[PDB]
Write an enzyme that holds these catalytic residues in place. Structure first.
Site, mmCIF file in Angstrom:
data_model
loop_
_atom_site.group_PDB
_atom_site.id
_atom_site.type_symbol
_atom_site.label_atom_id
_atom_site.label_comp_id
_atom_site.label_asym_id
_atom_site.label_seq_id
_atom_site.Cartn_x
_atom_site.Cartn_y
_atom_site.Cartn_z
ATOM 1 N N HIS A 1 8.149 0.685 -3.812
ATOM 2 C CA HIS A 1 8.740 -0.605 -4.139
ATOM 3 C C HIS A 1 8.860 -0.787 -5.645
ATOM 4 C CE1 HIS A 1 7.395 -1.453 0.065
ATOM 5 N NE2 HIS A 1 8.546 -2.101 0.084
ATOM 6 N N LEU B 1 0.819 -1.214 0.000
ATOM 7 C CA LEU B 1 0.000 0.000 0.000
ATOM 8 C C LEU B 1 0.853 1.266 0.000
ATOM 9 C CD1 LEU B 1 -2.777 -1.075 2.543
ATOM 10 C CD2 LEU B 1 -2.689 -1.431 0.069
ATOM 11 N N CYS B 2 2.107 1.155 -0.437
ATOM 12 C CA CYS B 2 3.045 2.268 -0.420
ATOM 13 C C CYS B 2 3.114 2.992 -1.759
ATOM 14 C CB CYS B 2 4.435 1.778 -0.016
ATOM 15 S SG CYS B 2 5.225 0.722 -1.247
ATOM 16 N N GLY B 3 2.237 2.651 -2.695
ATOM 17 C CA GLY B 3 2.283 3.299 -3.996
ATOM 18 C C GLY B 3 3.391 2.714 -4.849
#
Lengths: 60, 147, 136, 45, 163
Positions: E82, E77-79
């Site tokens: 990664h 959910l970090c966009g």
């Protein structure tokens, strides 16, 4: 020497205060223990007194 | 059945601090609370019996009048409190022991106060003797002053 | 009809309880991840959880107005924040038994007067402090 | 006013409900495997 | 659709919205804490790199081995964090392998391992996890460096990729 003297006198003072509390605490707690002993004894006769009349009234 | 007078369960109740007996003191407090609740639950004496109304409403003959006669003759006993006297005697012995301990502690306190007064008065001038300083600060035997 | 249908003591405790519970319900969404939250948010969560535990009540066991006002006072005044949230019910029952048994005079005075006066406030403070100290 | 409740994601049975069910099943399959391995090692004792 | 289906979908989306907003607040708090903690870390990193900044320490020529340190977290959910670091490490791996240099990669984030394991599975040297669940500290970095040295891969040239 001044620090030693003041340490000695304050040690004596605090020991005196500690013993002043200690002498009181024992009998202060013993009195309440004796009082609670009487508290434990109260509810004996009430059970029979209350139940006998209820039983007879139910019989009637 | 008048309630027996008792002192308030103040902080002195928790001041007992019995050896592995704090649970015993908590149980005693719970017993006191339960006894108060039981006393408040019902009146001092049970309600009276309406014998006249009962007989008016009792069609049976003999089984009712004799029942009322027995109820009048009925006399429930009351429990004994020998354990209360025994615990009172034990508390008296404990109080005697506490009084002896208090007298010993008072004697020790008098000795400590005398020692403190002697130390305060004996200070005198700072220009005292080396041997005189041993009253509150003496040395030791041989092989003592390592540093 | 609002607070106009309350006794003065119940109204006094209930205004604070209502405000605090509204604040908690505002921030109730973050309770799942409340560990990594602001100190104010965590304080609100704890206070609201304790108040909600206070609101729980058993069936067929109505409480007198003085008992309710005493419990709500012990709750809103922050005498339960240190206490475990699961232990509120046990504490509530024990405190009710204690105040009914030993401190019946204060409850009667609250009932008759209908308000928690400053002297009664101090007496309640002393009683709740003593019981909280002795609870463990 | 229309409101919602707890556990309404799986009730809708949409993409998110199936996703949650699959994620839970995949996690707990691994956890069951680990517990079975530990239990077998214990039973060997 | 019918009334029941609309109600179910609406309630599910309401719950999802509440959860996303709560996670937004949690991430804001964690971002504030990380921002507070970054300044001493920023100074420490600048000081550590100052020696190589003030000295022309450059690799002379081609080297057989090369270690790539892809720093990432385990959470999602970090966009595109990664995604961006994975793209960068893939590009660097391809560029350095075009020169015939043995490429090994160490990923401190389980997400990096998952992304690169489809293709660059063999190039993994040592994988770490439980990153981002708690704020990183020098102890974890020291452990990572210790096992990097203990891995037995004496990379003559090395690099690190981070956001």
């Amino acid at each position: 020497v001044k620090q030693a003297s003041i340490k000695q006198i304050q040690d004596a003072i605090d020991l005196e205060k500690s013993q002043q509390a200690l002498v009181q605490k024992r009998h202060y707690l013993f009195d309440v223990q004796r009082n609670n002993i009487a508290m434990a004894l109260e509810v004996t006769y009430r059970e029979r007194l209350h139940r006998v009349y209820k039983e007879i009234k139910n019989r009637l | 059945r008048k309630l027996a007078l008792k002192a308030i369960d103040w902080v002195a109740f928790g001041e007992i601090i019995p050896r592995n007996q704090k649970a015993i003191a908590n149980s005693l407090k719970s017993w006191n609370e339960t006894l108060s609740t039981r006393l408040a639950a019902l009146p001092e004496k049970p309600p009276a019996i309406d014998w006249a109304y009962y007989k008016a409403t009792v069609a049976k003959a003999g089984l009712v009048d004799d029942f009322e006669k027995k109820f009048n003759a009925l006399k429930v006993p009351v429990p004994e409190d020998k354990y209360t006297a025994l615990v009172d005697a034990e508390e008296q012995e404990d109080v005697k022991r506490c009084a002896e301990f208090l007298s010993l502690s008072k004697a020790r306190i008098e000795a400590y106060e005398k020692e403190l007064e002697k130390m305060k008065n004996i200070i005198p001038f700072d220009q005292m003797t080396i041997e005189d300083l041993n009253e509150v600060f003496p040395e030791t035997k041989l092989d003592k002053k390592k540093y | 009809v609002g607070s106009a249908a309350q006794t003065r003591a119940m109204k006094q405790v209930a205004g604070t309880m209502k405000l605090e519970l509204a604040q908690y319900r505002e921030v109730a969404a973050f309770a799942q991840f409340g560990s990594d939250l602001d100190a104010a948010t965590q304080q609100l969560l704890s206070r609201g959880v304790r108040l909600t535990e206070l609101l729980k009540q058993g069936q067929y066991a109505p409480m007198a107005i003085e008992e309710q006002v005493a419990v709500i006072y012990a709750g809103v005044r922050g005498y339960l924040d240190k206490l475990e949230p699961s232990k509120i019910t046990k504490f509530e029952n024990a405190f009710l038994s204690h105040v009914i048994s030993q401190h019946q005079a204060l409850l009667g005075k609250i009932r008759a007067d209908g308000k928690i006066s400053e002297e009664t406030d101090a007496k309640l403070k002393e009683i709740v402090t003593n019981f909280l100290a002795g609870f463990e | 006013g229309v409101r919602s409740g707890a556990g309404a994601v799986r009730d809708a049975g949409g993409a998110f409900g199936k996703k949650e069910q699959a994620d839970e099943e995949r996690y707990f399959r691994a956890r069951a495997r680990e517990q079975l391995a530990a239990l077998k090692k214990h039973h060997e004792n | 659709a019918t009334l029941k289906d609309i109600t179910r979908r609406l309630k599910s989306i309401k719950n999802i919205q509440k959860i996303t907003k709560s996670m937004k607040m949690v991430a804001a708090a964690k971002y504030a804490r990380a921002e507070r903690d970054l300044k001493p870390a920023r100074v420490y990193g600048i000081g550590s790199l100052a020696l190589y900044e003030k000295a022309d320490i450059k690799v002379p020529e081609d080297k057989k081995k090369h270690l790539i340190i892809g720093v990432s977290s385990d959470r999602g959910l970090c966009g595109a964090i990664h995604s961006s670091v994975a793209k960068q490490i893939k590009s660097e791996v391809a560029n350095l392998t075009a020169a015939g240099k043995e490429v090994k990669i160490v990923g401190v984030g389980d997400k990096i391992r998952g992304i690169l394991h489809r293709t660059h599975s063999d190039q993994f040297l040592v994988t770490f996890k439980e990153v981002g669940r708690k704020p990183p500290t020098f102890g974890d970095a020291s452990v990572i460096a210790l096992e990097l040295l203990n891995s037995g891969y004496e990379f003559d040239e090395g690099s690190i990729i981070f956001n």
